[PDB]
Structures are given as structure tokens and as C-alpha cells.
């Protein structure tokens, strides 16, 4: 149902190949993900760029057409993705939970950090395993940036990414935040690129 526009542009394919997003996982490999295609030697695999972009526009399509814009809570306990979820609230409503998940947030309506979202976006299913577990009690769809070795239980439509390098996670958040601004039209044009630089969505060392 997407006629001609929403395909992979060559101006965005240089961003994915240079940020090492196409690098897969180690010798460990989950059978549930049919994303292995022309595995490079020394044990690694190659994530399909043409499949990553198309599984990313369905993730931004669920974020759209929601009446409250603030019920999309991004979860991040990984140190490489703490900066890319606070600026996810600067453009959508999208209240984040960074650092500690403080469990008892989806249930336990007594506490002061009780959030009742509609769509939970997860950086990594291993470290944010409490967000996936508590979402199975209160009926929340879960989107996760699953690696090829990440567990894929209790998660919906996922974007195959790498989480081993500094630049592989943050550019995916740049693509998710851009497509939820092209939808719900603030920038009416899709041919011209988005206004500001993609270096803003990358974690900075304290040194």
C-alpha cells in the first residue's frame, strides 16, 4: 500500500553502511530470525540493509495514528543509548524512561513513576528485560531493536540492528525520530532531507 515514495533512498543508504548497522552478530545466532544473508567470514553475519529500512517504516507507522502522543515510552538502560531517548521526547510527546527502569511502573498504580503507555520501544531485550516482562501483564505492544543473537520472546515487529559499536544504535533512533516527523506532517517534503544534523543522536563520553 506504499506506492513509490517510502522505498530506500541512496542518500540514506550511505548512513547505514558507514555506521556499521549492517554488521550482524557473533557465532551465536538465533534461528527465529531469517535475516542471515551472505555472512562475512571470521564468524560475523551481515544484516540486510534493504530489510532493515522496511522493518523500520512499520515501526514508525504504529507510532503514528495514536490520539495521545505521550503514551509511547522508550526504554533504555544501555549506556550507548541513553542520549538517543531523551531527545525522542523533544520532538514527539513520548515520555522516556532512561537509566533504571524502576520496576513496578506498568503495574503498581500506587507509586509516583507509574506510567501507562501504549507502545514500548526497547533498545535491547537483554538489558531491558524487565520492560518486556511487565508489558505482558497489562497488554502493551513491544518494539525492540533486536540483534541477531538477542532473545525474541514477547516482542512484536523488530528492527534488526547491531549493538556492539558506538554509532550503530544512535543512527537508528535518528531514522525512527525522522519518520515520525514526516508522518504527522511538519515537514511536508520527503525528497529534501530533514533540517538538523544526525550527529545529535550519538552518545558522548564523559571525558
Amino acid at each position: 500500500s506504499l506506492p513509490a515514495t517510502f522505498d530506500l533512498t541512496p542518500e540514506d543508504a550511505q548512513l547505514l553502511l558507514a555506521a556499521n548497522t549492517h554488521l550482524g552478530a557473533r557465532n551465536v545466532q538465533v534461528h527465529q530470525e531469517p535475516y542471515v544473508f551472505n555472512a562475512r567470514p571470521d564468524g560475523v553475519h551481515v544484516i540486510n540493509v534493504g530489510k532493515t529500512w522496511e522493518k523500520l517504516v512499520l515501526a514508525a507507522r504504529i507510532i503514528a495514528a495514536i490520539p495521545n502522543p505521550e503514551d509511547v515510552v522508550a526504554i533504555s538502560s544501555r549506556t550507548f543509548g541513553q542520549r538517543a531517548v531523551l531527545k525522542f521526547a523533544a520532538h514527539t510527546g513520548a515520555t522516556p524512561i532512561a537509566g533504571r527502569f524502576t520496576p513496578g511502573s506498568f503495574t503498581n498504580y500506587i507509586t509516583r513513576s507509574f506510567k501507562e503507555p501504549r507502545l514500548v520501544i526497547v533498545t535491547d531485550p537483554r538489558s531491558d528485560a524487565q520492560a518486556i516482562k511487565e508489558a505482558s501483564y497489562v497488554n502493551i505492544p513491544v518494539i525492540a531493536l533486536t540483534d541477531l543473537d538477542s532473545p525474541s520472546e514477547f516482542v512484536d515487529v523488530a528492527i534488526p540492528c547491531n549493538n556492539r559499536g558506538k554509532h550503530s544504535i544512535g543512527l537508528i533512533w535518528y531514522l525512527l525520530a525522522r519518520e515520525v516527523l514526516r508522518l504527522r506532517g511538519a515537514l511536508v517534503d520527503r525528497t529534501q532531507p530533514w533540517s538538523i544534523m544526525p550527529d545529535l543522536y550519538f552518545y558522548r563520553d564523559p571525558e
Partner: protein
């Protein structure tokens, strides 16, 4: 479930899972319903015209909600050869 004349008795026909064709019951708290927007050219997502995909709690506990959504969304017409029927 009806009777001799009129009277559609015993209401609440429950929801069925779109993947495994199983009944999603009341206390199944792992059930997930997906709302997918109908978009067109030049923005305009038009909130209100949804594509409702309902998934049960068994598919998520098995760990196949990522793969069952690939079958149920490509046959509607909004994907391409990413998901292969041959395996």
C-alpha cells in the same frame, strides 16, 4: 447459539487471534492488538482508519510475534519479498 425465534442469546463472541486462529480469552493478559495506519501521498496519516492486527499471548510466549506479523502484513500488500514463504 440462537433459538427458535429471534433472541441472539449468549453474547460476547470473543476475539480470535489473527495468526494462529485461536480464541483470545478474558484473563489472557499477554494479548496484543496492533493498530496500523492507512497513509497516502504527502503525509496525511488520517488517524481513525486503522488496520487492526490482533495477536494472542501464546505467540508472544513462544517468541514468534515478529515472524507472525511478517505474514499477516505482507499479504495485505504493504511489504515486499523481505518475508519469504519458502524456508
Amino acid at each position: 447459539m440462537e433459538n427458535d425465534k429471534g433472541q441472539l442469546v449468549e453474547l460476547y463472541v470473543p476475539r480470535k487471534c489473527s495468526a494462529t486462529n485461536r480464541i483470545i480469552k478474558a484473563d489472557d493478559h499477554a494479548s496484543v492488538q496492533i493498530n496500523v495506519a492507512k497513509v497516502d501521498e504527502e503525509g496525511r496519516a488520517i488517524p481513525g482508519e486503522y488496520v487492526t492486527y490482533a495477536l494472542s499471548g501464546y505467540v508472544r510466549s513462544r517468541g514468534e510475534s515478529d515472524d507472525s506479523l511478517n505474514r499477516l502484513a505482507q499479504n495485505d500488500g504493504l511489504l515486499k519479498n523481505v518475508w519469504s514463504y519458502s524456508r
